[PDB]
């Protein structure tokens, strides 16, 4: 069973930057090796067939490269719509091996997050919990601190965050923390407040609101 | 054009059953080689099961070998994968693909995915509660909460809204439900004066909402 060994497996890297990726096989695979690109929640898109073809549609920038059994895909300049996991394969026998992919992160400005907070909807008081969701938006790097305070209390274990994935053309990241009560919890507290700590952001900014208001 | 349509994922339990089907329009599959590839949850791709439709040979992956069958009907244009004895590690996206029989050696057309997820838990719909939108921007949002199995489509005025729209991967809670928000952004001016609504869809409990989120 022959393996793709591929690296890294992920890398960050600027707008027009070159980005080489590296597939090993563990035995000679002569040309049959494939590229591909994989969206999140994506079929594979297939970049590079024969080690070194460009599949007819896939962009310029894209090429592949053989030397042995190391094999090379090469971005010569980088586009935000080039986020996405890629793959090598081979096809010299069977069966067919993919490397473990590598995760391409586009490296972008600093962008500070504009956090908004929501408070929960009545139906979901009337069905007996209490959602508050805070919402930071449009942000790079993906590193952030969202913190919760009840009644100016540090909450934790009752909250959970969910990250977008990268933006295809701004390169920024979205996120929601929602903190999860029993609606008898909820109504027990006032002031409920989110506190997020970014690199763009000077002082972590505090978005609050007042239940019943 | 080519086009390979798969359906038949869903929710099973750890020990049961699923037929997936791979729908091949645009070429015929007794002229290629058809492939099922699988990608379980924040992990790589993983080869399945390869089947020649002209004679049904087939060749297995270890870890499946025994456990699933693929099969094909020239007929249809379908090819299939029926699995047995379904464990945890097996819950994955499952993906068919046809072998580059004219000219390029690779997998160059693929299904959209279908998920399969091996859980004891069962069905539950969600519940959609409206992010109520509280002069610059404003954002507002549908919160679709503790449904199982994954996934959900959600979509803003029928489709019609897609730009600002943020809908995020589903995280699953303590409880053993997911839950996720879908949220917008919009002109201020545009509050009252456009109406907004979110398309909900869960299809394992026949679940479509349709919540319109208002100040």
């Known amino acids: 069973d022959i393996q793709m060994t591929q690296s890294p497996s992920s890398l960050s890297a600027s707008v027009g930057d070159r980005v080489t990726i590296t597939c090993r096989a563990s035995?000679?695979?002569?040309?049959?090796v494939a590229w591909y690109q994989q969206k999140p929640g994506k079929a594979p898109k297939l970049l590079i067939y024969?080690?070194?073809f460009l599949y007819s549609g896939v962009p310029s920038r894209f090429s592949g490269s053989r030397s042995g059994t190391d094999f090379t895909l090469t971005i010569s300049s980088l586009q935000p719509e080039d986020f996405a996991t890629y793959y090598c394969?081979?096809?010299?026998?069977?069966?067919?091996?993919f490397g473990q992919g590598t995760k391409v992160e586009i490296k972008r400005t600093v962008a500070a997050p504009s956090v908004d907070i929501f408070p929960p909807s009545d139906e979901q008081l009337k069905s007996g919990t209490a959602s508050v969701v805070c919402l930071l938006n449009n942000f790079y790097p993906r590193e952030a601190k969202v913190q919760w305070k009840v009644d100016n209390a540090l909450q934790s274990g009752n909250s959970q965050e969910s990250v977008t994935e990268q933006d295809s053309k701004d390169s920024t990241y979205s996120l929601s923390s929602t903190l999860t009560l029993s609606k008898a919890d909820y109504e027990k507290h006032k002031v409920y407040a989110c506190e997020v700590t970014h690199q763009g952001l000077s002082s972590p900014v505090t978005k609050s609101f007042n239940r019943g208001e | 054009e080519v086009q390979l349509v798969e359906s038949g994922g869903g929710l099973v339990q750890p020990g049961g059953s699923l037929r997936l089907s791979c729908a091949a329009s645009?070429?015929?599959?007794?002229?290629?080689?058809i492939h099922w590839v699988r990608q379980a949850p924040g992990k790589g791709l993983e080869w399945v099961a390869r089947?020649?439709?002209?004679?049904?040979?087939?060749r297995y992956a270890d870890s499946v070998k025994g456990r699933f069958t693929i099969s094909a009907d020239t007929s249809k244009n379908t090819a299939y994968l029926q699995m047995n004895s379904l464990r945890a590690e097996d819950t994955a996206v499952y993906y068919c693909?046809?072998?580059?029989?004219?000219?390029?050696?690779?997998?160059?057309?693929w299904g959209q995915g279908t998920l399969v997820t091996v859980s004891s838990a069962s069905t539950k719909g969600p519940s959609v509660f409206p992010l109520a939108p509280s002069g610059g921007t404003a954002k507002l949002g549908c919160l679709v909460k503790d449904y199982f199995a994954e996934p959900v489509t959600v979509s803003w005025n029928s489709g019609a809204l897609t730009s600002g729209v943020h809908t995020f991967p589903a995280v699953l809670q303590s409880s053993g439900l997911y839950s996720l928000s879908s949220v917008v952004t919009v002109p201020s001016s545009s509050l009252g004066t456009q109406t907004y609504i979110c398309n909900v869809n869960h299809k394992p409990s026949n679940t479509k909402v349709d919540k319109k989120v208002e100040p």
């Open positions: 089947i020649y439709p002209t004679n049904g040979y087939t």
């Open positions: 394969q081979q096809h010299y026998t069977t069966p067919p091996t």
């Open positions: 035995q000679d695979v002569n040309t049959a």
């Open positions: 645009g070429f015929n599959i007794k002229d290629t080689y």
């Open positions: 693909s046809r072998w580059g029989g004219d000219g390029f050696y690779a997998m160059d057309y």
């Open positions: 024969s080690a070194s």
